[model samples]
Each structure stands twice: as structure tokens, then as C-alpha cells.
Target: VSESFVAPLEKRAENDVPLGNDVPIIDLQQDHLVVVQQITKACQDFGLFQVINHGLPEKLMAETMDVCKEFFALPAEEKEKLQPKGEPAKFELPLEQKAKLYVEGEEAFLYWKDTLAHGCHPLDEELVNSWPEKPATYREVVAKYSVEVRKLTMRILDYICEGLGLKLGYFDNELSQIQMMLTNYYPPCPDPSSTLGSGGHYDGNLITLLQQNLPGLQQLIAKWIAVEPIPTAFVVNLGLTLKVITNEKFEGSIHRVVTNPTRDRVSIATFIGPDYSCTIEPAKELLSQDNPPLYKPYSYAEFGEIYLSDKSDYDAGVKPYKIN
Candidate 1:
């Protein structure tokens, strides 16, 4: 079951950073070092960046946001009908049934918002079955968005591969995992300051693409910086899987969400991961006679389980949980 459902994190209004109108747009076909530099800086300094013009059509983006808003605004009873169940359909069933089937200690911390997650796993079947019936267009729109984002993800990986001085397709075929999309709805809270919307954590996948209607998300950018929403942009972040693949060349950083006192916030995050069975170890090329392996080899499935467990406590550091 979930850990603890609480109110959204209060807003402190400390040194606010502007969403700089200068955010970069990454074009897959172009040799845009401008975009690459921005991404590298965001990853190294902020752990997140807002991306524009990456090629998802405006219509699809608009429709997806509209459908999410409509669906979340539905009555509690109707929303509960789509709550998920175990494996294949997990998080896509009735709340009561899901509660009964809940596994203990599955997630390190409970999330305070309403959410639905689905991907290509045994649980996917059940997850798809639980889609809300009222919003008939919801599934179709989201699925299409997922596919488009997957393509963009591959392009990003290709760039990362080149940046590492490896073959262009080196990381592509090894990424066998299915795409996972989570539609999260954070309702407005009366007391936004005392509670937390989501605790600090890093993504467990190779990479994440986050789309939100408003901007309450924050990252420990060397210090902490609140990320403002940019029109038609998706926030991207690197994850532990990528760090492992690159032998620590990239660092996965902590991120969290703050609540907006005046308005509800909705976001959809799509994670690109390697197939569960894919072996995730430090790349051999990254290690040599001079530099030995930094991390032991592990399956994506095993690493995912551990990563999810340590998510809430990620800010502590990365070594204590090593599977030595």
C-alpha cells in the first residue's frame, strides 16, 4: 500500500529563478550544439531542463492536457473506477480492489496525488483495463504521445552515445524496456506550506520526459531552484540507469514538487528504460586497463526494484545500497 498521503509541500518563496525565455530547443536532425550544451548544463547543474520544438505536434499536446484535466475533474466515484490492480493492470482498477491486492513495502514512500501508471509489463493488461470510461479519448491521446516521446528518447540516446565517443547505435538496441507513463494530478491544498506534494527522489529509469500544466517542480540545482513551466515544453532528466551505463559520467540528481496554493497542478511523465531482462552494467568501453569498472553488473529489473525502494532516501548518496 501507499506510505502516507499528505498535503502538497508549502511554498517558501525563496530566491525564485526565472524560466528564462532562452530555454533551448533540441532538433534531432540538426547538429545543435546549443541544445546539447543546454542539456549537459541542466543535467550537471540542475538535473532537469525544459525542452521546446522537439517535434510533438501542438494539437496532440493540447488534447492530452485537456483530456487529463477533464478526467481528473471527474467525480470521486467515477475516478475510482479506473484505479489499477496488480501486475499487467496495476493502478488501473477500483481503489478497494487495489488496496486488497497491494503488496507491502513496494514503494519507499507514498505519493499524495492521484495517479495512474502503465507500461509494457505483465501489469500492462490490468493497467489498460482500468482506463476511465468517461474520457474515451484519454487512452488514445496518451498512447500516441507515448509513442512520439519514445522516438524522441531514442534520438536523445543517440546524441548521448555520440557524446561518449561510441557508435551511434550503441545504446539504442540495449534499451529494451517499455515506456512508462504516469499521469499525476495534484489538487490544490488549503495549507500548501506544511505538507509535501512529493518527497525528493531521482528517476530509476535511463531518462524521463515530464510535461506539466503549471510549475511547482523543483530541483536541487547545486542548491535548489524552482522550475517554471514553458509553453509547449517537456522537462527532461537523466536517471540512474544512464549513470550506470556511462560508468558515472552522468550523475542522477534529486528532484521534488511543491504545491501551488491557488491552483491544481497536473503532469504526465514518460520514462524510457531498458527491457527488464536487459543487463545493465557499466559499459565495457567505459572501462579499460587504466580505469576499472565503477559499478557491478545488474539486470534492469533488479536495479529498478532497489532504485524504487531507495527513492525517498536518494538525497543521502548512492553507495550504501550497492549490491556487493
Candidate 2:
């Protein structure tokens, strides 16, 4: 039950600086101030962190993992039932189906990985339509897990606010945004060198929580740093959305997944972001005489629409400002 896969390098020893044993782990039940300090430092320096003994119950977490494994193990035909239904042109299916769409180049030039993209937010009226028909309990479990994760996400944001010296509730009041979850499955590659599991890129949302069966995932530290896996822990990454909210106090890091030669890899990653209607421009407070605004605000919905249309790449960087 090892958490991460081995990196394909001449040097077999894993580079453990960013993903090393010394990485900070925050306990949510501890004093709020301690949690805030730890979280802020992790975000400022590592751009990531892991939580242990967090509020999430072990039973529920175990059940959630079971459901994901069960879902992915289903027959291909049965799984296809959950495939998103909509106009191909608007959502751009054929391209996504072939994994040919990306922000930088065609999918052929990028890494290889299979992913199912979904949204769980107040505005996702089409959720039922896109979801596969599972046991009623399955839906209930997923919905419950989603809610719990959302609550935890908000708490993290509050700590982030404290770290930035902002009012405690600053992020809470404005976190009313949609969330995107991508269930990524990376199959064992016979030729790991020829194909990539996923390319290096940053996330567009405010934060991303990745839960993996084992680690084939790597984070870009000063150079390329491989993140070792730990059981029952999540790899959290900051995103462009948070950078905007914090007014440049924090930065989003570049990350990607690598191929595993021995075993298949499965991970469920959730991206919590601002509401579609909320503006995503730089915060006025972050600007100073020396620092200038780097990005213009745009609706999350607009950015997401374009994002969904092309699934090949993550974090296309800041886009031109436009009102929806």
C-alpha cells in the first residue's frame, strides 16, 4: 500500500525536499491560530501542504475511496453512461474524447491520461443529467462527501485570510463559487518514457485537493520535485483564483503527473473556486507603488466555459478581461 510511484530517473533515489518527510501537516482539531500559521507558511513557501487527523471521519473517507474505485472498475460501457451529455461543439467532445485539445498544443504533444471532469456546485443544475445511475446510496455518499469537503475548503480559506492579515471572514463571504472535480485514471504504461501521464501545469481554481491511491504525481519545486505519497492524506495546491483573492500574497505552483510503469494509478482531485458570477480580477489591496496589477478580473463562469471546452491543459494562465 505504498502511496506514490517511483520516478523514472537515472538516480533511483527520490528527491524528497518538497515532498520530504519534513513537510508540514496541520491538525484541524488543534488551536485555530496554530492551524492558521502552519497553513499560511505552507502556502507561502511550499505552495502545498497535507493534513492529518483532520475533521473528516475515517469511515466516510474509506467509503468515498471505495465508491471511486468501484466506479472506475465498472465495465467501460457502463462507465460511458456517466459521460457528459451536451452539444459537442460547445463542450468540444471529439477533441476531448481523443485528448487532442489543450491550451498550448494538440494532445498528441502532451501527456497521456484518462479523466472524467464534473462540477458540483449550487449552479450545476445539470448534475443529475451528467451523473451515472448508481445505487441511491452512492449518490447520497458522494453528495455528503462533496458538502463536507466544501466546508473544509472554506475553513482553509479562513486560515489563508488570517495568514494574509485580512479579516477572518474575508474569504468565506466571497467563496460562493462552483467546484470542479476531475477523476483521473492513469493506466500502467508499457513504455513510460514515450508517453506522459499528464503534463506540467497549474490549476485555475482557488485550491485543489488531490487524493491518490498511490503517487505517480510530481510537484514543481524550484526545479522538478517529486511528491512522495502518504496514506489517507491529500496533496493541496494553490491556484490562480487564490492568487487573485489574496492580491498576490500567495502564488500558484506548477505541477503534473508522471506515468507509472508497474501499476495503474487512480486519483480524485477536487477544485474549489469562486462562484461563476463572482469577478476574478486582482485585489486592489495587493497593488503597491512598486507592484502593478498582473491580471484583469473576469467571471469564473466565462473562464470555466472555455476551460471545459478544452480539457487537454490546466491553468491557461490569466485570460483577457471580458464581462459576461
Instruction: Write down the TM-score of every candidate.
Output: 0.79, 0.78
TM-score, prediction 1: 0.79
State candidate 2's TM-score.
Answer: 0.78
Superposed by TM-score, candidate 1 places the C-alpha of residue 310 at a distance from the truth, in angstroms, of 3.3
| Tens digit of per-residue lDDT, candidate 1, span 1-324 | 122444324323343544434333444435577555556655554456666777888688888888878877888676555543422233211212121111112123344466656562223446555445657787677667767778777777776775666787776675735566777777776655554566667777788988876877777644566667765877887887777777766767567776666788888888777776777777787788666666777766666655555534562223532442
- Model 2, residue 158: what's the lDDT? 78
Candidate 1 wrongly placed segments (more than 4 Å): 1-46, 84-110, 120-130, 174-176, 315-324
Best by lDDT: 2
Clashing residue pairs for model 2: 3-215, 4-215, 5-215, 177-274, 177-275, 281-297
Error of 1 at 196 (Å): 1.6
- Candidate 2's error at 84, in angstroms? 5.4
